[PDB]
Amino acid sequence: IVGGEDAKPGQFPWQVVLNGKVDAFCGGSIVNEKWIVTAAHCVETGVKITVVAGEHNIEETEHTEQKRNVIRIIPHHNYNAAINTYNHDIALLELDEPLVLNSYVTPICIADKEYTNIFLKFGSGYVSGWGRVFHKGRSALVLQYLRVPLVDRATCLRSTKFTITNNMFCAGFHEGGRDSCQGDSGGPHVTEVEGTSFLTGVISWGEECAMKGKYGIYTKVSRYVNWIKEKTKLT
Amino acid sequence: CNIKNGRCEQFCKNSADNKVVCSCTEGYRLAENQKSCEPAVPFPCGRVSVS
Numbered sequence: 001i002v003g004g005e006d007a008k009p010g011q012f013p014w015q016v017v018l019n020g021k022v023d024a025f026c027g028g029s030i031v032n033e034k035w036i037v038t039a040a041h042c043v044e045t046g047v048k049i050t051v052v053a054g055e056h057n058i059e060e061t062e063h064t065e066q067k068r069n070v071i072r073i074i075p076h077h078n079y080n081a082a083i084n085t086y087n088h089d090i091a092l093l094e095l096d097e098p099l100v101l102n103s104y105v106t107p108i109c110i111a112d113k114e115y116t117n118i119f120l121k122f123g124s125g126y127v128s129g130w131g132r133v134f135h136k137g138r139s140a141l142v143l144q145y146l147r148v149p150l151v152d153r154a155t156c157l158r159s160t161k162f163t164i165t166n167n168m169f170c171a172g173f174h175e176g177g178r179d180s181c182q183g184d185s186g187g188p189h190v191t192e193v194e195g196t197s198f199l200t201g202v203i204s205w206g207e208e209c210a211m212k213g214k215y216g217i218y219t220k221v222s223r224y225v226n227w228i229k230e231k232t233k234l235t
Numbered sequence: 236c237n238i239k240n241g242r243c244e245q246f247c248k249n250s251a252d253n254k255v256v257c258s259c260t261e262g263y264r265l266a267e268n269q270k271s272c273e274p275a276v277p278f279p280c281g282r283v284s285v286s
C-alpha cells in the first residue's frame with residue numbers, strides 16, 4: 001500500500017497474509033473459519049502455501065497469529081480463460097484446520113450481489129495489506145491501510161490501454177500518490193456500513209503504483225458472491 | 236426501501252402495502268425494533284472488537 005498508514009492491531013481482523021516460495025506475497029480475507037478469499041493470480045500452480053491470520057507485524061511476534069496450511073485452491077473457473085487479462089481474478093483457499101475466531105481473527109461480511117454493488121457504489125472503500133509502500137520499493141512490516149474513492153467507469157477506461165471488464169472496478173485518486181501495490185493482491189477492498197464491513201473488491205492489478213492518471217484495479221466481488229457462498233459452505 | 240434503505244441497518248426488501256422487511260447478514264439477528272442488526276454470535280463478521 002502506497003501512501004497509507006499503519007493499521008492498529010485488530011483493526012482489520014479479516015485480513016490474512018499468504019506465505020510460500022515467497023514470503024508475504026499476497027493478502028486474503030477470511031470468509032469463515034475454513035476459507036480464505038484471495039486473487040487467483042496469487043495462486044496459480046499447486047505450489048504449497050500457508051495463511052497467517054491475526055497478523056500485524058510480519059517480522060515480530062504478537063501472539064495473535066494463527067498459521068494454517070492450504071489444502072485446496074479453487075480459482076474462479078473462468079480465470080485464465082483468456083490470457084493475461086486478469087479477468088475473474090479471485091480464488092478460494094481451504095484451510096487444513098479451522099481458524100479460531102476472536103478479536104484478531106474475524107470474517108469479513110459478504111452481502112448478496114445487489115447489496116455488494118450498492119455498498120461499492122457508496123464510493124469509498126478501505127484496502128489493506130503488506131505490499132510495497134513505494135512503487136519498486138520495500139514491502140511493509142506493519143499492516144497498511146488506505147481509503148480509496150471509487151472511480152467512474154469512463155474515467156477508468158481512459159486511464160489505461162488495457163481492458164477493464166465488467167468484473168473489475170477502478171479506485172484511487174485523480175492526483176495519484178495513494179494506491180495498492182505489488183504484494184497487496186488478494187487482500188480486501190471493504191466498505192464499512194454503519195460499523196459493519198462488507199467485502200466489495202479484491203486487490204487485483206495496476207500499472208506501476210500510485211501514478212497520477214492511473215488507478216488501482218479491483219475484482220468486482222458483487223459478480224462472485226454467489227460463487228463464494230456456493231463453494232465455502234460449512235457443514 | 237427507496238429512501239434510507241427502508242431504515243434497515245443492513246438489508247431491505249419491498250413487501251406489500253408500501254412496507255418493508257429488514258434482514259441481516261450471517262451472525263446477526265434482526266433486533267426487536269425490526270430495523271437494526273445485533274450480533275448473534277461472539278465474533279460476527281465485519282466487526283472490530285479489539286478496541
Ligand SMILES: *C[C@@](*)(O)[C@H](CCCNC(N)=[NH2+])NC(=O)[C@@H]1CCCN1C(=O)[C@H](N)Cc1ccccc1
Pocket residue numbers: 025026039041042086131179180181182183184185186203204205206207208209210215216217
Ligand atoms: C498480484 C498482486 O500483488 C498485484 C497487485 C498490483 C496492484 N497494482 C496497483 N497499482 N494497485 N497484481 C499484479 O501483479 C498483476 C498480476 C500480474 C500482472 N499484474 C500487474 O498488476 C501488472 N502490473 C499489469 C501490467 C501492466 C503493464 C505491463 C505489464 C503488466
Ligand SMILES: [Ca+2]
Pocket residue numbers: 055056057058059060061062065
Ligand atoms: Ca507478527
